[PDB]
Each structure stands twice: as C-alpha cells, then as structure tokens.
Amino acid sequence: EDRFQELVDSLKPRTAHQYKTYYTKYIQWCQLNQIIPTPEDNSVNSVPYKDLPISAELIHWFLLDTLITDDKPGEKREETEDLDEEEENSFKIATLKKIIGSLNFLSKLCKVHENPNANIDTKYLESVTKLHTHWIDSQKAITTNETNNTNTQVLCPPLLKVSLNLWNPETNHLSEKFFKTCSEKLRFLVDFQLRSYLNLSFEERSKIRFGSLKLGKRDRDAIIYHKVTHSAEKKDTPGHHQLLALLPQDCPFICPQTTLAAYLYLRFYGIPSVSKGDGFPNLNADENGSLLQDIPILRGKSLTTYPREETFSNYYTTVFRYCHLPYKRREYFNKCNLVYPTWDEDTFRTFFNEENHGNWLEQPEAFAFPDKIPFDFKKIMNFKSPYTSYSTNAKKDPFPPPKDLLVQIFPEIDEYKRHDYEGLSQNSRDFLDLMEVLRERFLSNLPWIYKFFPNHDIFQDPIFGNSDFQSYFNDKTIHSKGSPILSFDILPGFNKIYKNKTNFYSLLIERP
Amino acid sequence: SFNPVRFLELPIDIRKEVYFHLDGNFCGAHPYPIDILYKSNDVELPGRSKRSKKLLRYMYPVFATYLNIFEYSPQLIEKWLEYAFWLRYDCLVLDCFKVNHLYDGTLIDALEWTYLDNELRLAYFNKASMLEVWYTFKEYKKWVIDSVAFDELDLLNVSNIQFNIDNLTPQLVDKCLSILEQKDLFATIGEVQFGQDNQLTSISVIRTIRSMESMKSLRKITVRGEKLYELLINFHGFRDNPGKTISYIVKRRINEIRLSRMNQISRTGLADFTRWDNLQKLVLSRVAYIDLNSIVFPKNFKSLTMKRVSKIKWWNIEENILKELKVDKRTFKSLYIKEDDSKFTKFFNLRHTRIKELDKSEINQITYLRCQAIVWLSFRTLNHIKLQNVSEVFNNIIVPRALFDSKRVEIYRCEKISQVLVI
C-alpha cells in the first residue's frame, strides 16, 4: 500500500484509463484463450491481481493475435492506397507502443499486489518495438523519395541488387581472381543471404553445420537453424535457445533455400568435366552429432572447414564496389542490434511445453509461435508481411514440379529410402528430408534461373537438355514472353517498381 | 427523487458550496476514480442490449476520440449515451456554470476549446478527463453568460477558457486554431497547456506558439513535459532565437506558470525564470525534485505554490543564519529554538509538524532583524507558499514571522514534513 500513491500519480488520468482499456483487452484475450480461468458463468467476471499471468511471451502473443494478425477477411480490401495503409500501420505501431507501455504498467501494478508470475523481461518487448520500428521505417523509406540524393537506393535495395549480380554466370567486370567459378559465387551468395535473412555476425555464420538445419514441424517450408547453446560459448546457466528460420521467397533469385540447394548441388556434384565437387557424404556411420556436426555449410581451404574472414572482407568490398554500394564494417561483420530473440531455458521449458499447459484452449506453438519461433520476427527477418498472418502467399503454385524430375537428381535419398530409412540415425534422415525440401524448391525455381541465366554451371551436364527438363522449363516460362512486367513477386514494398522487366533488367550490369 | 426547483430557490452561497463539492461530476455515468481500481483485489471486466446498438452506432462516432478511453466496461458508455442527450441542457448544470462564471471561474475548473461534431464547441472535462458538457460559443454566450450578465458590462467578457493541446490531434490543433482564427475568439481563451506525450518541438506546439501573439488575453500558461519545459519556457541560456521560441511580447502578458508533472526543473545548473518578467504565481504540480537555490525568481513574483512533490531541498536559509549569530548547528537546535504555540499557531492545526521559533532572551533585538533580513534576502519579496503533499525536506524549513501570520504560508498535507521554524 506504500507504492499506490506514486503509482497513481505517475500517470495522467487519460493515460491511466487508456492503459486500463489496453490491459482490459489483454485480460479479455487471456480469458477467451483459457490462460487465466474465468471465475463463474453469467456474473461479474473478475480476476485477482495476485494470480494474473504476465510475461514477455504472453504479452507478445497477445500482440500477435490481436494487433498484428490484422487479417479481417470481411474488410481486408481497404489497404490498396499507400496513404491509407501508411496511416493504418502508423496507427498500428502507435498502439503497439501504447499497449506495450500499458502491459508494462500492469506488470508493475501486479508486483505491489504480490504476483510472482509477473516479470516483463522488457528487453524482449523493446526488441519487438525495434523490429516493427525497423519495418515501418523501411515503409517510410519507400514512401519518401525526396529525403536525399539517393533516390536510386530508395528504390533499389542492397539484397536484390547483390543477389541478381551474383547469379550472373560471367564475371567479365566483377572480378578476375576472386569470383572465377560459379560455385564460389553461389557460396558467397549463401553467406550473404544467411547474413541478410539471419542477422548474425560472422562467427555464428562460422558455426553453421549441416545437422544444425532442422525442418518445420509446423511449416515444413522453413529451415530451422536451432542455434543450440548449452553452458559454453561465453555464457553460464546452460540453456539459451535462439531459433532461426529461412522461408522460400517469392523471387527465385533472393531465396535462401534455392541458393542453398544450388550450392549444395554444385558442392556434391559440381561439373563432371571442369571441377569435381566434394562428393555426397556417407550418412551411414553418422553418430548423432559427429558427421553432420563436423561438416560446414560451405567449403574453404580444406574440404571440411569454414573459409577465411578477410577473404569474405575482400568479397564484400569487391561486390559493393561492383554494385556501387557503401560498405561499412559493423553492418556486415559484427553483431546486429536487431536479432532473433534468444530465450532462456526456464521460459523455454515452462511456456512451449504443451503438456504443462493443458488448461489452455489453444497452444502457442499451434498458430502464432510456429516451430517455437516468434511470428513477426520470422516474417520480418524473412522480408514478408506479417499482417495477413495465415494466408497462402508462398503457396501460389502454377506448373508444379513433377516427381519424375525429382527422382532424376540426387538419387541417393531414393537409395536410402530403398535402404533401411528408419535404421539410420535421426540426423541422417532429417538431413535427407531437408535435402528433399531443398531439391523440391530448387526444381521449382530452376526454370526462372534457366530463362534469365541459361549459362549457369548447373547446366554443365548434358542430361538437362532432355525432353522433360526443357519441357518443364518451357511450361513454366511460357507466360513471360510478352508481358511487360514479371509474374512472381519480389519484396513487400518493391512489387510496384521492380516487378516491371525494364527496371529488373537494369538491376543487372552485364547483359541487362 | 431530487427536486430541481427547490434547489434553485435557496440562495447562491449554498448553491456555490454544493457545486464546489460537486467537483465537475454532473453525470451518474462516471468512471471509478483511479484509487479504487488499484486498491482492490479483483479486476472488473465486461461480460447484450437492444437500444444501445442504436446509440453506439450513431452517437458514439461523434464522441469516438474523447470516449474510446473507456472501452473497458462498455456499460459505462451505454449508460453515458442517455446522459449525452440531456445533461448539457440541464438546469442544475447550467446553474453550475452560472454560479461558476459569477465567481470568475473558481468553482469548476477550466472550460476547454475542442472540435467535436464539426463545430468548434467548448468542452468541460472532469478530473478523470471525461467530457460531460459541450457548448458552442453562441450557446454558451446565450443562456449562461447572458443569463447572469443582465446589464453589468464587467461580466459580459468571457476570458477564462483553456486551450489544452495534448487533448487532441495536431491536425485537430491546426483546424481548431484556424476556426478560432476566423472568429474573434483569441481574447476568449484564458490559458494554454502543452503536451509532447536535442531541441526538437512537436507540430502541435509550433502551431500553438505561432498564433499565441494574437491572444491579448492570455495568462496562466502551463506545460506538462520535462523535455518541453527545458525548451519553450525555461531560459536555457539562449536569449536570441527568432523561430521556435515563445515570442517575448506574450511573455509579458501572462500572470502565472503551472509546471505539471516532471522529475526536476533544474536538470541543468539553474532553472532560471529570468524572462517571463511579469508573472506572479508559479505552481509546481507533480515535479519530483526541486531545489529552491536553483530558481532565479523575477523582480516582482509573489506566490510559489507547490503540491505533490517528492523531494524539496529548501532556500538553505539555515546555512546563512548560522553565519550571522555565529554558533554551531547543534547549539542552535538546542539553545535558540523556543517552540512557541501560543494561540495563532494552534489555529491551523498541523498536528504532525512542530512549529518552532527563535528566542527573545538570547537575541538582543539587533541580530534578530538581521536574522530576519537573512530570510527576506532568501525569499526576495514572495508571500504565498502553500506546501501541499510533500516528503523529505533536506534542509530545515524557515519561514518569517511577517509571512507565517495571516496564513500566508500554509502547509497542508503533513505526514513526513516536520519541524518548521519561524524566523
């Protein structure tokens, strides 16, 4: 009762009743999702402050399911104009900051009423605020063209420019002694897209193995880099979980799954006449944590090691001077300010365990925390729109790839399926189904790569000039010979500029 | 039931004192004051109707801005919307505004310009920041102002309306000042507030300042922020800036300055009021820490009231008294202090503080007038003090005899404050 006077006087009455409106929305959401039990039926519904569950993940999951899962299937169609949608998501970010402030005030209000289940862990919600601030500022950057003398970079992003320049099979002006082979350009593009879509430093990119890439138990579309950390990288209190995600993009040239599958194709096979690859691995004597946890995601000097840092420094410098982009050191080497959230073991065991929350009507892992990843972090760091939140945006599939073209590349997975597929280690068949998903994405995105860059070293093999390969190529690329704009999408803002073929070809420097 | 006519037959002192304790609350559809909602275990939550569906569709988008604050418990809103037709025309409410304006804006506090229902009408907010009464200026001049200004021309002038940005959006600030420009209503307003919910100012503040020279009836200016207090009303060292400042011609006009809710007013080395060279009162409303040795206090200022503060230093008069009569602090506390409570000290109670006083047998009527000249050298011609809710004065509090009498200093909420000595 000592803290009540400076808790009332800390706010305006207007701000106090606005905050009470917002946490009343929160407590109504907690009652309609059975997080806190209702006291009775058809009476004065009232919860005590002593047992009101408040946490970072509960506040953020409320924020998801109410504020940023703005689907509204009866009134979705009022976001066509950029001015009205800009006003609407500016209202979204203002209400986001105000609801986070209100629930911070509610967590402060429950502590004086002796609530042990009210700890905010405010750096998580500040990371969420910084995340949506970054996205709304990117939309502020596209909606404002006259900020400075950089209107080209207002239009053009770094990721699309560097990606489409690194899909170029010829390097007559890129580099002479740095980017000779196309496999080295593909592993550079793997490193650049694992930098862009996964905001890590260089050392977490060095930690990437084959066995550290899981699959989506909820999605099957996402590549789950479970950055497992127990008690030794710098940090004690062992369990610190940072989950990561790679989604297939709309454009087949900025997709991390397509680029990863292409470099793994040129790594396992390569060119039979020019550069024989590293070969397909054993996957038979795999201990759970030996073989796939000793092989990196890209080769370097030796065949089973990670490359050198200043080589990638020179690669970044030569690509950004070829693409005319201002390089800075911390924005591509050091740790980013806005990263995926790294959980602790206590909340990761208490919250995501579905058997300890059987009273809840709807588990968080089911819809709003897919693959134990926060939703908005996933669909912002994978460059999507998190506001429709349950649609089929990436599932738009004309001319799907057949199984006959699937069983003609990477036949080793078919051999293991005709081997004892269950008797192997868990990481082995997990990596096999990982390569199945990557091969399906690669086979889906292959006709656009053949149509726009036919001279790439995937096609240094005369089995690709057969009837079925070129027939599927023509069947998927028949609808692009007369259209002025492209068919597939690029980015959530950049589909009204660089969807036109003229600007998309002027992205290129050699052979526009 | 309640009889309206019998209440309006009894004379105006009793009606004043009824509408005094009726703070601003005319309605029965009022929110709970924010002390009961927090000193309670339970949290009152909502959870069907037939008539309110007609009210929440038509009446509610008119009052969306000022009443979306109360979306918790919408029984408070569907009860509100029957008051929203008839309460502004009530004879009790209009009689309250009559007896307020007859006492120069003392009874119910600060009518406010707003722009609702496309009109630029007035508004009255209670202490819970809920509107209850909205009048356009023709209707407000017609049946309350002209209803008591029968023939006396010193009461036709209505110069006590606050303007109060942070109530409303900066687009509505622009539209309100434009419609207030196209009418002759700048002499109508009485004071302005400021919001902002590294010298950067908001858009609604710049719009308010650029039309503030045209007021010619502006007093009682007030701010609410700290990062805005340090910019537009504090001196801050700068003395020559044409744009973004608060236009020195209107600095001369104002009577007083209210400082609403901050942490410190002397965040820098000095909370200097060198300008605003014509203000009389200064009310520190909820500032956490103020030092009286860091305020520079103009040539003619009289009142420094200060409520709801958390820490006060003092004007450190005790550091200058002990150099005058040249003793130690421990000898002063036990030797020169008399603690007399004869009859006028016991009038206003102060049962928790202990009002003290210097001797007469140990000071020979010289270096008593010097010990009093120390106190008047520290106060510099102020009279009214008014310590409300306070805590933990660092230096001990020193008041002169010429100002302690006639209740010109007035400590009100005495729990942690103690030991005021009067010299």
Asked if B224 and B265 count as a contact pair (C-beta separation under 8 A), the reply is no
Sequence-separated (6 or more) residues with CB below 8 Å from residue B333: none
Q: Which residues, listed in sequence order, are joined to residue B259 by a DSSP beta bridge?
A: B223, B284
Distances in whole angstroms, Cα of residue B81 to Cα of each of A36, B31, B56, B64, B129: 32, 14, 8, 12, 17
Tokens representing B316?
A: 């450190």
Of B158, B159, B116, B110, give the one whose Cα is nearest residue B135: B116
The residues on B that touch A, with CB distances below 8 Å, are 31, 34-35, 37-39, 41-47, 68-73, 127-129, 197, 261, 286, 308, 310
Q: Which residues contact B219 (CB under 8 A, 6 or more apart)?
A: B190, B191, B253, B254, B255, B256
Q: Which residues contact B230 (CB under 8 A, 6 or more apart)?
A: B236, B267, B268
**B108-135: b (≥16 Cβ within 10 Å) or e:** bbbbbbbbbeeebbbbbbbebbbbbbbb
Q: Is B1 exposed, middle or buried (0-12, 13-18, 19+ CB in 10 A)?
A: exposed
Phi/psi of residue B125, each to 5°? -110, 140
Pairing state of beta strands B303-306 and B281-284?
Answer: parallel
Closest to A130 (Cα-Cα) out of A337, A311, A272: A337
Residue count (chain A):
512
Residue A255 token pair: 């997709």
Cβ–Cβ < 8 Å for A187, A265? no
Cα B63 to chain centroid distance, Å, stands at: 26
Instruction: Give dist(CA B193, CA B180) in Å, integer.
Output: 16
The DSSP result for A115-138, as a single string, is: -TTB---HHHHHHHHHHHHHHHHH
Residue B55's φ and ψ, nearest 5 degrees, are: -80, -40
Instruction: Give buried/exposed letters for A102-124 (b at 16+ CB in 10 A, else e).
Output: bbbbbbebbeebebeebebbeeb
Least CB–CB distance from B38: residue in A8, A15, A47: A8
For tokens 């519904």, name the residue.
Answer: A45
Question: CA B209, CA B232: separation in Å to the nearest integer?
Answer: 9
Classify residue A51 as exposed, middle or buried by CB count within 10 Å of its CB (0-12, 13-18, 19+): middle
Residue type at A493 in one-letter notation: G
Inter-chain touch A17–B68, beta carbons under 8 Å: no
- The encoded tokens of residue B249 equal 């011609």
State whether B72 and A21 contact (CB < 8 Å). Answer: yes
Question: Which residues make Cβ contacts (< 8 Å) with residue A413, sequence separation at least 6?
Answer: A432, A435, A436, A439
Q: At what angle do helices B317-324 and B369-379 cross, to 10 degrees?
A: 150
Residues A254 and A260: beta-carbon distance below 8 Å = no
Give the nearest chain B residue to A28 (CA atoms).
B45
| A107 min Cα distance to partner chain B (Å) | 13
User: Which two structure tokens, joined as six digits, stand for A274?
Assistant: 């020019």
3-state secondary structure A211-279: CCEEECCCCCCCEEEEEEEECCCCCCCCEEEEECCECCCCCCCCCHHHHHHHHHHHHHCECCCCCECCC
The CA distances from residue B125 to A17, B37, B91, B100, B171, in Å, are 14, 20, 18, 15, 21
Interchain contact, A18 vs B31, CB within 8 Å: no
Q: Which residue has the tokens 């933990």?
A: B392
Dihedral pair phi/psi, residue B158, rounded to 5° = -115, 100
Question: For residue A66, how many C-alpha atoms fall within 13 Å in the half-sphere facing its CB?
Answer: 22
Write phi, then psi, for A43 (nearest 5 degrees): -150, -165
Spatial separation of the C-alpha atoms in residues A239 and A233, rounded to whole Å: 11
What CA–CA distance (Å, rounded) separates B257 from B254? 8
Does A209 contact chain B (CB < 8 Å)?
A: no
Q: Compute the distance between CA of residue B367 and CA of residue B360 in angstroms, rounded to an integer.
A: 11
Between CA B123 and CA A477 the distance in angstroms is 66
Cβ within 8 Å, pair A27-B43: yes
| Interchain CB distance below 8 Å, A45 and B47 | yes
* Mutant choice from A9, A20, A45, A95 vs B, greatest count of B C-beta within 10 A: A20
Q: Which helix (H) or strand (E) covers residue A205, if one does? A: helix A202-206
The pair of structure tokens assigned to A174 is 């890129």
Contact residues, chain A, for B168 at CB < 8 Å: none
Q: How far apart are CA A164 and CA A449, in angstroms?
A: 10
How big is the CA angle at A202 (ends A200 and A203), to the nearest 5 degrees?
95
Cβ of A62: how many Cβ atoms within 10 Å? 24
Minimum Cα–Cα distance from A52: chain B residue = B43
Q: Which of B35, B129, B310 sits opposite A14 (nearest CB)?
A: B129
- How far apart CA B21 and CA A512 sit, in angstroms, is 80
Counting one residue from chain A and one from chain B, the pairs whose CB atoms sit within 8 A come to: 71
C-beta separation of B160 from B112 below 8 A: no
CA B325, chain centre distance (Å): 40
CA–CA separation, B48 vs B50, rounded Å? 7
Query: Phi, psi (5° rounding) for residue B132?
Result: -125, -30
Chain B residue whose CA is closest to A17: B69
Which H/E stretch holds residue B18?
helix B12-21
Return the DSSP state at A491.
-
How far apart CA A29 and CA B42 sit, in angstroms, is: 17
Angle of CA points A208, A212, A214, to nearest 5°: 135
Whole-Å CA distances, B146 to A477, B150, B152, B265? 81, 6, 10, 43
Q: Which tokens belong to A324?
A: 């005319």
- Beta carbons within 10 angstroms of residue B208's beta carbon: 23
Residue B177 main-chain phi, psi, to 5 deg: -70, -25
List the 50-69 stretch of A: residues with Cβ below 8 A of B: 50, 52
Residue B179 to residue B114: CA distance in whole angstroms: 11
Euclidean distance between the first and the last CA atom of chain A, given in angstroms as a whole number: 72
Residue A46 contacts B where some CB pair is shorter than 8 Å? yes
Contacts of A242 (CB under 8 A, 6+ apart): A227, A229, A339, A340, A341, A342, A343
DSSP code of residue B304: E
Please give the structure tokens belonging to residue B45.
């939550």
With CA atoms as reference, report the closest residue to A314 among A297, A299, A327, A298. A327
What is the per-residue DSSP string for A70-88? ---TTSTT---SHHHHHHH
Upper half-sphere CA count for residue A504 (Cβ side, 13 Å)? 20
| Residue-wise burial string across A64-91, b where 16 or more C-beta atoms lie within 10 A, e elsewhere | bbebbbbeeeeeeeebeeeeeebeebee
Strand bridging mode B122-125 / B131-133: antiparallel
Residue A16 has its nearest CB partner, among B34, B41, B197, at B34
| Contact assessment for residue A138 and residue A493, using Cβ atoms and an 8 Å cutoff | yes
Chain B CB within 8 Å of residue A8 CB: yes
What DSSP character marks residue A54? B
Pairing state of beta strands A46-48 and B42-44? antiparallel
- As a whole number of angstroms, the distance between CA B233 and CA A471 comes to 76
B204, B177 contact by CB (below 8 A): no
Distance CA B195, CA B199 (A): 15
CA angle (A20, A24, A26) in 5-degree steps = 120
A31 contact residues in B (CB cutoff 8 A): 45
Q: What is the DSSP letter of A488?
A: S
Residue A164 CA to residue A507 CA, distance in Å, equals: 7
Note the Cα B199 to chain centre separation in Å: 26
> Is some CB atom of chain B closer than 8 A to the CB atom of A24?
yes
Q: How far apart are CA A227 and CA A211, in angstroms?
A: 11
Q: What is the DSSP letter of A68?
A: I
Give the pair of three-digit tokens for residue B325: 């009569």
Place of tokens 């909370």: B271
Distance (Å, whole) CA A433 – CA A213: 11
The beta-carbon contacts of A495-500 under 8 Å, at least 24 apart in sequence, are: A497/A155, A498/A155, A498/A156, A498/A160
Residues near A177 by Cβ (< 8 Å), separated by ≥ 6?
Answer: none
Rg (CA), chain B: 25
CA atoms within 13 A on the CB side of A395: 6
Q: Quick one: angle between helices A256-268 and A182-196, nearest 10? A: 150
What is the spatial distance between Cα A107 and Cα A118, in angstroms, rounded to a whole number? 6
For chain B, counts of helices (H) and of strands (E): 15, 15
φ/ψ (deg, to 5) at B79: -80, -35
Residue of A4, A31, A48 with shortest CB distance to B42:
A48
β-strand partners of A209: A296
Contact A173, A322 (CB under 8 A): yes
Helix axes A158-166, A182-196, angle to 10 degrees: 160
Q: Which residues contact B39 (CB under 8 A, 6 or more apart)?
A: A1, A4
Rounded CA gap, A233 and B394, in Å?
Answer: 50
Judge: B70–A17 Cβ closer than 8 Å, yes or no: yes
Give the CA count within 13 Å in the CB-facing half-sphere of A298.
Answer: 22
Best of A14, A44, A105 to substitute, by most chain B Cβ atoms within 10 angstroms, is A14
How many C-beta neighbours within 10 Å does residue A178 have?
16
Cβ-count burial A216-254 (b if 16+ within 10 Å, e if not): beebebbbbbbbebeeeeeeeeeebbbbbbbbbbbbbbb
Tokens linked to B105: 């804006």
Q: What angle do CA B312, B314, B318 make, to 5 degrees?
A: 145
Phi/psi at B212 (5° precision):
-85, -20
Q: Write out A401-451 in H/E/C secondary structure.
A: CCHHHHCCCCCHHHHHHCCCCCCCCHHHHHHHHHHHHHHHHHHHHHHHHHH
What tokens were used for A183? 């496999």
Domains of chain A in start order, with CATH, are 1-149 (no CATH), 150-512 (1.10.443.20)
Distance separating alpha carbons of residues B244 and B246, to the nearest angstrom = 7
Query: Å resolution of this model?
Result: 3.0
For B275, the 3-state DSSP assignment is coil
The technique by which this structure was obtained is: cryo-EM
Residue corresponding to tokens 């230093």: B313
**Burial category of B65 from C-beta neighbours within 10 Å (exposed 0-12, middle 13-18, buried 19 and up):** middle
Of B34, B72, B128, the CB nearest to A24: B72
